[PDB]
Amino acid sequence: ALSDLQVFNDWAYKTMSEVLDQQVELFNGATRGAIILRSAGNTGDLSEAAFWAKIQGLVRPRDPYSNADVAAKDLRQLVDNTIKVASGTPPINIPPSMLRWIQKNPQEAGAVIGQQLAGDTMQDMLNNGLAAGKAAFTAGGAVHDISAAGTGLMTQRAFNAAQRIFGDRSTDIQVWVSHSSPLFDLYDNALANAEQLYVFGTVNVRADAFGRPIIITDSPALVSGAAETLRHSTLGLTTGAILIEQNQDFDSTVVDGTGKQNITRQYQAEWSYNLGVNGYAYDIATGGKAPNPTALATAANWDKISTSIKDTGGVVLVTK
Amino acid sequence: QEAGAVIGQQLAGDTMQDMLNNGLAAGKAAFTAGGAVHDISAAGTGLMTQRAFN
Amino acid sequence: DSNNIKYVREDAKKMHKLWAHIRMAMEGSRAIKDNAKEFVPHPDNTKATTPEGVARYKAYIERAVWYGASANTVDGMLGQIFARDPVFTGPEDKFDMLINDVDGSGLSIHQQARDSAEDALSLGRGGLFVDYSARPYIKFIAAEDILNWRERWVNGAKRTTLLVFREESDADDDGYQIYKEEVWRELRLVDGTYWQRTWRENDGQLYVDDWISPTKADGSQFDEIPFVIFGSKNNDPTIDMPPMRDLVELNIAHFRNSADYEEACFICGQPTLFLSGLTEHWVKNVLGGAVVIGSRDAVPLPVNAKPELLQAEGNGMVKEAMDQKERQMVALGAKLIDSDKTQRTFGEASMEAAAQNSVLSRVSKNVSDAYTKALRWAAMFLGLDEKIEYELNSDFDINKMSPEELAAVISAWQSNAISFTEMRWQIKKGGRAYLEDEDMRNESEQDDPL
Amino acid sequence: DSNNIKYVREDAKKMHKLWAHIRMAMEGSRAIKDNAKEFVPHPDNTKATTPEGVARYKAYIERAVWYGASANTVDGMLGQIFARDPVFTGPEDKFDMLINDVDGSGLSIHQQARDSAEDALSLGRGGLFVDYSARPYIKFIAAEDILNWRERWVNGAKRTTLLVFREESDADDDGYQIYKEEVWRELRLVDGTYWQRTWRENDGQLYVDDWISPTKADGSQFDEIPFVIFGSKNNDPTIDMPPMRDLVELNIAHFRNSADYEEACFICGQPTLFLSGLTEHWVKNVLGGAVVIGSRDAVPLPVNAKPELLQAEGNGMVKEAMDQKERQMVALGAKLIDSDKTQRTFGEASMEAAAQNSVLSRVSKNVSDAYTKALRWAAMFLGLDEKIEYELNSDFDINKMSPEELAAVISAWQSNAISFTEMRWQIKKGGRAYLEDEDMRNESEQDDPL
């Protein structure tokens, strides 16, 4: 990649900070609307919306000769939910006295913390959204497991199971997000086709053979275990399945704490965003008012609001 | 900045109050020290009357 | 589209410390003394840890005097640049609202130009924003306010595709307190079309607004984001080196030397008797712990006793360094301070005038280009004339014009060499007229009293 | 309700101290010596607490000399700016009431303009307020009187929404005690309309009056608050940095150095005999505590005795410190002192005149714009002509016009290149004319006496 070792305009002049190693460009159009990244603030620690419910016995058989007794019916009002997630930054010890390296750059410390923090903030948003989506779909009963069958990952036979689960409305699933290992298993199976439905020119297909491209990210939320118990999670998303909504409340202070022989200069940052999963509500009482990723990724903290699985958007597939 | 503004307005009010109160207390103490005191509490019933002002 | 709108380009974060340093150097002696820790090192930091050390450092800083060369430099440069007023070219009646109240605050366009030139001379960065209300408004942007800008190539050209800048405003609440409400404008250029958002955050309540596409009077949207970033070097989004860096550093060094010199003045500038060869018996017996030093009385001393009036002598090395720093600031500056003692030959400075006034001319041309571009953008809002100009005074070194200069310019206008408006501009630049050209014509049409 | 009409902004509170110290520096030696406690630190705090220490400190301060070149600075700057008389352009007889008594107190607009210019040169702030009585009155709001303001954007424009200033007066009773009662004016702008209240304070209460909407002679109320705040930088609500900071700090340093030098003059300035190698027995024999030191009388000394006068020698390092500080005060450009020994070669003064006169031109332009705006607002109140102007003397270094200069100006008027009013203007600036040009025309229209 870029080196820029040839010319040194300034010492370590933005030349490298190994800013990030995981693909985090999975927001709005990048996820085809599945994970929409927005900027609209809201107060408190929640966001509740109410919408009417489907009347279960709306249409009933009628006996014209004897109407008998009219069954009493009534209408409800469901509640939506959007938890607010708080994310900060550990105190960063800036070196106040410039440390006399080959590259002497005191203020470049904060200058590079800015960009590294931006990258890690977007990474954290994506990872928390993916973990919360997995947890909500698992709590809603939208999971499939193919680990026990064969190698544990089929090329395309795996996706048909998720289509069967999500049902008649399967057309509205646009994107599968997955770790890189399932994609490489896909390539390996395609590269040696048992039923030769692949040709050398079409063995590098990134799509799922149904018009749903696979989007690849190395999110730790999609992997768990090691060696024999290693599992990969691939979850398909409809439009608007995952809502990560920023509040644009970034706070940043630099303090000259000192207190020692040498001056102590620190760095701290604070921000927040609202995480929502379509068709699901975060159980505020069961979880917490300011949940952490451990609580967000934990099931039984998500409730099924939509009457049918077809209404909610998302299905999760576990592959080993 | 709303917190700073709230503190500012309450601080202005309380600063006015504190200077007024300390000035009045010092004035009363100085007038007692100088012997310019008249007591109505002892004289009959101690209530405000034009006689006390006179 | 939607992201951390408060993000600052990391090289702007590089330049914040320096920009704050020039702001402090311009603010004056009080600002420098307030943060003297960043400028004057303690002579012994191990002392500085102790409370006696910090008290000594406080007293040491207070006795120092700030020379204030950078502020005088900027003031003199601005005064030279804005001799008389910049002239407007084109229709003057159609552009009157932009001239008299450019931003709608009654602040004339020349005063905003003065602020822009001051910024471009001091810290060498600024910006102009022109947006529709129905009347266009030409904003002024501080250097620390422009916080993001990028450049992709569409059809292989330099096109600033992103530009986000902060805005400061005080919420108009019921009471009399002062908040500080921030507004961000996200200027985005996609496929040769101008788009913008507003991020008003009143009461912390994000009233984020939908993308909009401003349109000219005839329509056809826009092809370029109307925001020129004028600087000391050129109208480039890249940050330019502030012109005052060397002068500020010299001022700081002279301030440190001044601190040392003033401490020496306060301690060892006073003569002292230093009665040597003396015994306690003699003191307690004839002196009695008290010496009379007036010319009325005389003092005795024992055998082989030598008194010595000791006091620090002048022309020391510290003051010599101070003098050399003063000369250096004079040398690399331009009309910042004046030395009545030395004389300068006429004609010798005539050849060096162009070299001496380099930064002035460069900033003048840069700001003239920026303001002309902004005026053209506002005209395209209004659908007005496009061939208009706003040039800052480029002929420096202005004084009252000589009688022979007057004869020459009148003769030149009498020939078909200088226009009437050109001649009036000449005669006004020399401080010889004040009425507008049309009014002078109207008065001079009438027959003379004779 | 808030009821905090007297609240002052934090930055105004910050600037109160600098404003007060600038006022003290302009005030003279009395104010500084009354408060030399801050400017002159005690040479020893341990003695400073003690009574003989405070006696010594009082005797130390009383011998100090306040050079006071800041007052001379401001006086010279004002004299250069306000030489002759600022020119008012417009129908004069409609505006004669304003020119004659600008605030109904008999002071001409020129004197109030001079006061505003002095306040702008000194501490860089001021305020002109126009209100309706029928007659409009141009107030003069002191720099410290503006105690609150607010800046809010509506329709993307700099509009001032709130502005509160204190108005001082003296209570009118039959007695002779002088009260000092204040009324606070709250200038507010809601939905582009100018409103007004006055807060009164008496008998332990705080009055509030009804909101009023002052209107023009043509009605239509107002769109801008009729209040202008001027300074050195520009006509902005934000504080402009006072121009006297450098001179004030240098003058304070010169004052404390003069204190030290005068203490040295008093103590060690007078010579003393300092008889060395002297025994008590000889003194009690012949000296007896009395040594006649006239030229008539000679006194002997014992063997190996040495007399030696000892007084502080000149060109001391403290003196050279004061000298360099005075040269610095000159160098910052202030027209504070002249120098008879210095000789300048002409042809180079005009090279840098535009730089020496920078703040003068800036203040001239700012005050001219402020008074122009105030006059326009008064015209709007009366419903009279709007194309009126008020400009100060923008050409400094004025002097008697030379015969060659007069001839050149006259020849310029012969051609239709300079107007007759312009010629009269220049000839009056040259001090070559005094009576009004209309009287000139009336007299000169008649035939020559022959």
DSSP annotation of C285 reads I
Instruction: Pick the closest to residue A21 from A219, A170, A264 (CA basis).
Output: A219
Under DSSP, is residue D413 helix (H, G, I), strand (E, B) or coil?
helix
C342 touches chain A (CB under 8 A): no
Residue of C172, C265, C406 with shortest CB distance to D161: C172
Pairs of residues, one from chain C and one from chain D, whose beta carbons lie less than 8 Å apart: 319
CA distance B1 to chain C (A): 6
Chain A residues closer than 8 Å to C206 by CB: 39-41, 247-248
CA atoms within 13 A on the CB side of C428: 18
Helix (H, G, I), strand (E, B) or coil at D180: coil
Among C227, C141, C216, smallest CA distance to C189 is for C227
Nearest to A248 by CA among A11, A90, A37: A37
Read off the tokens for C126.
Answer: 């600024």
Give the minimum alpha-carbon distance from B44 to chain D in angstroms, rounded to a whole number: 31
Exposure of D317 in the CB half-sphere (CA atoms within 13 A): 22
Radius of gyration of chain D (CA): 31
C205 touches chain B (CB under 8 A): no
* Tokens read off for C162: 């992103």
Does C touch B (3+ CB pairs < 8 Å)? Answer: yes
Residues C334/C359, Cβ–Cβ less than 8 Å: yes
CA distance B23 to chain C (A): 27
Tell me whether residues A107 and C2 touch, CB distance under 8 A.
Answer: no
Distance of CA D120 to the CA centre of its chain: 7
Q: Report residue D395 CA to chain centroid gap.
A: 20
- Min CA distance, D87 vs chain C (Å)? 10
For residue A65, give every residue at least 6 positions away whose Cβ sits within 8 Å of its Cβ, in sequence order, or none. none
Show Cβ contacts of residue A141 under 8 Å, excluding neighbours closer than 6 positions: A304, A309
Q: Structure resolution in Å? A: 3.7
Is D417 within 8 Å of C403 when comparing Cβ atoms?
no
Q: ∠A196-A202-A206 over CA atoms, to 5°?
A: 115
| Distance of alpha carbon C121 from alpha carbon C19, whole angstroms | 12
User: Containing H/E element for A134?
Assistant: helix A108-139
Distance CA A249, CA A273 (A): 9
Cβ(C53)–Cβ(C41) below 8 Å: no
CB contact at 8 A, D139 and D131: yes
Q: What angle do CA A207, A211, A217 make, to 5 degrees?
A: 40
Instruction: Kindly state the tokens that stand for D442.
Output: 């009336």
Integer Cα distance of A209 and B12 in angstroms: 72
Neighbours of chain C (3+ CB pairs under 8 A): A, B, D
Dihedral pair phi/psi, residue D148, rounded to 5°: -165, 145
**For residue C144, how far is the Cα from the chain centroid?**
14
- Per-residue CA distances from B31 to B21, B34, B51, B53, B54 (Å): 15, 5, 20, 16, 18
How do C146-153 and C158-169 pair as beta strands? antiparallel
Stated as kind and residue range, the H or E segment containing A86 is strand A83-88
Residue carrying structure tokens 């007889």? D93
In angstroms, the separation between the Cα of residue D177 and the nearest Cα of chain C is: 34
Beta strand A214-216 with A175-178 is parallel
Question: Residues C390, C375: contact at Cβ < 8 Å?
Answer: yes
Which of D268, D362, D425 has the CB atom closest to C271's CB atom?
Answer: D268
Task: Tell if the CB–CB gap between B9 and D10 is shorter than 8 Å.
Answer: no
Rounded CA-CA distance A37/D184 in Å is 51
Residues 174-193, chain C: which have Cβ within 8 Å of B? Answer: 175-180
Roughly what angle, to the nearest 10 degrees, separates helices C403-414 and D403-414? 20
Whether the Cβ atoms of residue A298 and residue A225 lie closer than 8 Å to each other:
no
Q: Contact C302/C282 with Cβ under 8 angstroms?
A: yes
- D171-175: list long-range contacts, CB under 8 Å, 24+ apart: none
CA distance A161 to A149: 13
Indicate yes or no: CB of B12 within 8 angstroms of CB of D10: no
Q: How far is CA C435 from the centre of its chain?
A: 31
Residue D266, C-beta contacts closer than 8 angstroms, at least 6 positions apart: D63
Give the C-alpha separation, D19 to C447, whole Å: 55
Would the CB atoms of D274 and C78 count as touching at under 8 Å?
no
Tell me the C-alpha to C-alpha distance, in Å, between residue D130 and each of A221, C306, D141, D187, D222: 69, 76, 11, 12, 13
CB-CB neighbors (< 8 A) of C204 in chain B: 2
Contacts of C17 in chain A (CB under 8 A): 107
Residue numbers of C between 39 and 68 with CB closer than 8 Å to A: 49
Please name the amino acid found at residue C405: E
Strand partners, D306: D276
Tracing tokens 């159609």 back to the chain, one arrives at: C94
* Shortest CA gap C179–chain B (Å): 6
d(CA D433, CA D429): 8
Chain breaks in chain B (C to N over 2.5 A) after: none
Q: What are the distances in angstroms from CA C369 to CA A32, C100, C384, C396, D385?
A: 44, 20, 18, 18, 35
Backbone phi and psi for residue A31, each to the nearest 5 degrees, phi listed first? -100, 15
Contact D7 B13 (CB under 8 A): no
d(CA D117, CA D248): 19
Distance CA C199, CA C206 (A): 7
**DSSP character for C124?**
-
Touch criterion met for A and D (3+ Cβ pairs within 8 Å) = no
Give which of A31, A57, A10, A86 is closest to A242, Cα–Cα: A31
Phi, psi of C36 (to 5 degrees): -65, -15
Lookup: tokens for A228? 């024999």
* Helix H or strand E segment including A139: helix A108-139
User: Which residues does chain C have within 8 Å of residue B9's beta carbon, measured at their own beta carbons?
Assistant: 175-177
Nearest Cα of chain D lies from the Cα of B11 at a distance, in angstroms, of 10
Name beta bridge partners: D163: D149, D187
The residue of chain B with its CA nearest to that of D1 is B9
CA-to-CA dists, residue A184 to A153, A154, A174, A178, A206, angstroms: 11, 11, 21, 11, 10
Residue D13: list chain B partners with CB under 8 A.
none
C432:D426 CB<8 A: yes
Closest-CA distance, D205 to chain C, in angstroms, reads 19
**Closest among C152, C243, C215, C143 to C189, alpha carbons compared:** C152
> For the residues of A301-317, what is the DSSP string, one character each?
SEEE-SSSTTTS--EEE
Shortest CA distance to C366 belongs to which of C247, C232, C211, C242?
A: C232
- State which approach was used to obtain the coordinates: cryo-EM
Counting one residue from chain B and one from chain C, the pairs whose CB atoms sit within 8 A come to 13
Which residue spans within C52-157 are E strands per DSSP?
87-89, 127-132, 136-141, 146-153
φ, ψ for residue A239 (rounded to 5)?
-65, 130
Task: Say if C399 is an interface residue toward chain B (CB within 8 Å).
Answer: no
CB-defined contacts B:D, below 8 A:
9
On whether any CB of chain B is under 8 Å from the CB of D448, the answer is no
Interface contact C10, partner A, CB < 8 A:
yes
CA dihedral D39, D43, D45, D48 (to 10 degrees): -80
Q: How far apart are the first and last CA of chain C?
A: 75
Query: If we measure between CA atoms, which residue out of A107, D237, A297, D2 comes closest to residue C14?
Result: A107
Distances (CA, A) of C350 to A291, C77, C79, C361, C408: 74, 18, 20, 16, 20
H/E stretch holding C413 reads helix C403-414
Identify the chains in contact with D, defined as 3+ C-beta pairs within 8 A: B, C
Sign (positive or negative) of CA dihedral A174, A178, A184, A186: negative
